[PDB]
Design a protein around this ligand. Structure first.
Ligand SMILES: *[C@@H]1O[C@H](CO)[C@@H](O[C@@H]2O[C@H](CO)[C@@H](O[C@@H]3O[C@H](CO[C@H]4O[C@H](CO)[C@@H](O)[C@H](O)[C@@H]4O)[C@@H](O)[C@H](O)[C@@H]3O)[C@H](O)[C@H]2NC(C)=O)[C@H](O)[C@H]1NC(C)=O
Ligand SMILES: *[C@@H]1O[C@H](CO)[C@@H](O)[C@H](O)[C@H]1NC(C)=O
Ligand SMILES: *[C@@H]1O[C@H](CO)[C@@H](O)[C@H](O)[C@H]1NC(C)=O
Ligand SMILES: *[C@H]1O[C@H](CO)[C@@H](O)[C@H](O)[C@H]1F
Length: 497
């Protein structure tokens, strides 16, 4: 492991500095010997997944906070964690020298980094593009004879995805999402603004749009990339809004239901891509459970829908219990999956805040709350941005766990990177969320998972200023005596047998 080279930009914590010759690294994860536990600790003060070990005690006495593992109490299985290979991300990574590129990609995708196993891939242009394009801009090409991948895919995104897969030891799942159709399929004839597909589900416009998904997957398959899943549309509610500023395609939940049932579901099912999963919604969880009810109460739509993709941007107005909890209750066999998060997009948020501990805590608080309400995975937005939070053709600049400083052939790993890694590094695909109850009211956020081998993983976030002594009880094994410092995040690992 190589330590963090810290740098302050005058915010609440440090970034770790990487360049062509140096980047901080971790050891590949391992469980310690039976009878001991591992603690990985990150702090506002500058600790970055510092490993310490402790004994498991047979007995515990006292009045302090106790978190008791309920290992028999099983919830959702984890799909995983990752981020988005946008045009903007690809441009920022490729602007680094090749050795710096390799250290950034290792930071995310290697076991010396944080073990990402998900990459979200835009289907043509979005706001995090410098050019507006689709794969089929030749007007009225209903046959899609002129469908093709431009250089944004063949020269930037696809070769970086191959390099990520070659560094990953875990199987990586690709997730595709479209922002806009070709403008000649749209009521408004523009990539942005209020507008939907022309006509109605089951017609030539909708059949052409469903076939565009298959042409997309065919073209990526010619480049030796296969997808785990696609979404039915990125943020379909966006295209319902007057003056929506960037690429969108409006669907009411009824429109999405009928498009899935008549066009997208049957087209994917009748193709070589029949095993690719379809996720609905791909929008703010405030739209649940209503959207889920509208789509999944129609059996002809429900039979094509694998899962419900959620974005975090209205989480502050949408309690998890009423949205995620109620959706899981109504549709327990339809997985919930978090597919897009970033800080900096809101009117009251600065785009980039280098070294922000607050933004790290936003990520870990989000991931814990999602895991506690049945969500199987959590996906960051842009993998890397420049110090302005771009590039972005509408200047919708936001923050990223990695910020690239081209002039210094440098990149900065922010608190968000480490907060994400406290989960992604230690929670492989097939891990299962298990119960964890507190003996008393407390200011901590915590979640417990059982690793596929039966071992325990617990993440404890303290967003308060106060140090909290605590004990973790595993009824089979014994007690971990520990302390959760103010503004810390911990990952605990131990074997149970
Ligand atoms: C890529 O980033 C590398 C890591 O930041 C850069 O290496 C660094 O370059 C600076 C300037 O030459 C050096 O700073 C000096 O550091 C010494 C103290 O060195 C020791 O203690 C530090 C702090 O714990 C430790 O990190 C080092 O390993 C040393 O043990 C001071 O006495 C000087 O006054 C001055 O501050 C760094 O030593 C050096 N860091 C490392 C880890 O090598 C490298 O220059 C960058 N590459 C490019 C191409 O820009
Ligand atoms: C733990 O508590 C039990 C019950 O009082 C006691 O009999 C036993 O000796 C204790 N074990 C250890 C290892 O202290
Ligand atoms: C679209 O494809 C057809 C059939 O291969 C070709 O003849 C036509 O010239 C193409 N149009 C453009 C604008 O590339
Ligand atoms: C999700 O939100 C981010 C932040 O505004 C946008 O950049 C994406 O296009 C959207 F899908």
């Amino acid at each position: 492991a190589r330590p963090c080279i810290p740098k302050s930009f005058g915010y609440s914590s440090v970034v770790c500095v990487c360049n062509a010759t140096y980047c901080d690294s971790f050891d590949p994860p391992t469980f310690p010997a039976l009878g001991t536990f591992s603690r990985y600790e990150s702090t506002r003060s500058g600790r970055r997944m510092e490993l310490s070990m402790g004994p498991i005690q047979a007995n515990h006495t006292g009045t302090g906070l106790l978190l008791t593992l309920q290992p028999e109490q099983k919830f959702q299985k984890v799909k995983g964690f990752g981020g988005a290979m946008t045009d903007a991300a690809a441009l920022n990574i490729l602007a680094l020298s090749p050795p710096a590129q390799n250290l950034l990609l290792k930071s995310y995708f290697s076991e010396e980094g944080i073990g990402y196993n998900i990459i979200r891939v835009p289907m043509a242009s979005c706001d995090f593009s410098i050019r507006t394009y689709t794969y089929a801009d030749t007007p009225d090409d209903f046959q899609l004879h002129n469908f093709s991948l431009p250089e944004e895919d063949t020269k930037l995104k696809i070769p970086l995805i191959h390099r990520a897969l070659q560094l990953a030891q875990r199987p990586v799942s690709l997730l595709a999402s479209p922002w806009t159709s070709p403008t000649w399929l749209k009521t408004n004839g523009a990539v942005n603004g209020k507008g939907s597909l022309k006509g109605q589900p089951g017609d030539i416009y909708h059949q052409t749009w469903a076939r565009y998904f298959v042409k997309f997957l065919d073209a990526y398959a010619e480049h030796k990339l296969q997808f785990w899943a696609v979404t039915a549309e990125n943020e379909p509610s966006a295209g319902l809004l007057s003056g929506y500023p960037f690429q969108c395609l409006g669907f009411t939940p009824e429109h999405q239901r009928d498009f899935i049932a008549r066009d997208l579901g049957p087209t994917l099912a009748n193709s070589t891509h029949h095993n690719v999963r379809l996720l609905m919604l791909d929008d703010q969880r405030l739209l649940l459970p209503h959207w889920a009810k509208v789509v999944l109460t129609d059996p002809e739509a429900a039979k094509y829908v694998h899962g419900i993709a959620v974005h975090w941007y209205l989480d502050f107005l949408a309690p998890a219990k009423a949205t995620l909890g109620e959706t899981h209750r109504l549709f327990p066999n339809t997985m919930l999956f978090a597919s897009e998060a970033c800080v900096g997009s809101k009117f009251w948020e600065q785009s980039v805040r280098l070294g922000s501990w607050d933004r790290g805590m936003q990520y870990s608080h989000s991931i814990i709350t999602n895991l506690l309400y049945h969500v199987v995975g959590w996906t960051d937005w842009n993998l890397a941005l420049n110090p302005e939070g771009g590039p972005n053709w509408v200047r919708n600049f936001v923050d990223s766990p990695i910020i690239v400083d081209i002039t210094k052939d440098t990149f900065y790993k922010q608190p968000m990177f480490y907060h994400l890694g406290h989960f992604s590094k230690f929670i492989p695909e097939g891990s299962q969320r298990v119960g964890l109850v507190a003996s008393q009211k407390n200011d901590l956020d915590a979640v417990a998972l059982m690793h596929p081998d039966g071992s325990a993983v617990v993440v404890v976030l303290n967003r308060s200023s106060k140090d909290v002594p605590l004990t973790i009880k595993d009824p089979a094994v014994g007690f971990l005596e520990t302390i959760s410092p103010g503004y810390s995040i911990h990952t605990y690992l131990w074997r149970r047998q």
